[PDB]
Amino acid sequence: LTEVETYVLSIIPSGPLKAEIAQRLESVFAGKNTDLEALMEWLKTRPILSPLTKGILGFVFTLTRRFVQNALNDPNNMDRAVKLYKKLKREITFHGAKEVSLSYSTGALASCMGLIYNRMGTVTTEAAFGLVCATCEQIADS
């Protein structure tokens, strides 16, 4: 979480929105804000954020919806996603997961988040965080 965050914020364009998001990630994290629905509707209606970025945030929040499924979602990316997912099912640590994921393209990583978002419980939370981190990192690096 505390690692994840700075990686997540790095793909948010500058402005008061970044602060709103950091604020919301932290209060969810801390179990202070428990209203996922109010949160998801809030996120769904945010301007500025690319659909992919909304989907990634939606995933993170769900971790800590059609617009998320569609955002995360070509066949080449889907094939690679399955191959990454095979590995992540076998990942128990955050860094193990992160290091493996970084070897895949942004499209494969997004699609892989998509796979897991329809199959929560098929990879551990640490693994899911690792994937989020790698995805954000690749996005920021371009």
Side-chain angles (χ1 to χ4, degrees), residues 69-130:
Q69 269 159 356
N70 293 340
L72 294 177
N73 271 306
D74 183 75
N76 323 279
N77 278 352
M78 282 183 289
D79 165 72
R80 280 230 109 193
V82 168
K83 293 192 186 321
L84 169 49
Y85 170 79
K86 263 189 194 104
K87 295 164 182 71
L88 290 178
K89 292 187 70 172
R90 298 184 273 227
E91 293 293 345
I92 211 254
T93 69
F94 169 81
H95 295 280
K98 181 178 176 61
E99 298 171 357
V100 171
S101 298
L102 281 173
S103 76
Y104 288 84
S105 63
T106 297
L109 293 183
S111 258
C112 190
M113 289 188 279
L115 289 185
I116 289 174
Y117 187 69
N118 307 331
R119 305 172 187 64
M120 293 284 297
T122 49
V123 309
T124 64
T125 320
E126 291 78 4
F129 279 107

Side-chain angles (χ1 to χ4, degrees), residues 11-14 19-22 44-45 49 53 66 68 85 92 96 101 103 106-107 112-113 117 119 133 140:
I11 72 179
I12 307 175
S14 284
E20 299 175 6
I21 287 159
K44 168 165 186 188
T45 58
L49 308 182
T53 306
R66 211 69 193 110
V68 181
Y85 170 79
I92 211 254
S101 298
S103 76
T106 297
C112 190
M113 289 188 279
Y117 187 69
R119 305 172 187 64
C133 191

Side-chain angles (χ1 to χ4, degrees), residues 1-5 8 21-36 39-40 43 56-64 117 120 125-126 128-129 132:
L1 2 186
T2 205
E3 165 135 13
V4 156
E5 190 170 359
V8 179
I21 287 159
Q23 211 159 242
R24 286 165 212 248
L25 287 166
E26 296 166 21
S27 69
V28 173
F29 280 14
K32 273 202 173 64
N33 188 346
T34 160
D35 199 359
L36 173 58
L39 186 60
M40 283 293 105
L43 177 64
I56 289 163
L57 278 157
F59 187 80
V60 170
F61 284 138
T62 305
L63 211 39
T64 61
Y117 187 69
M120 293 284 297
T125 320
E126 291 78 4
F129 279 107
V132 162

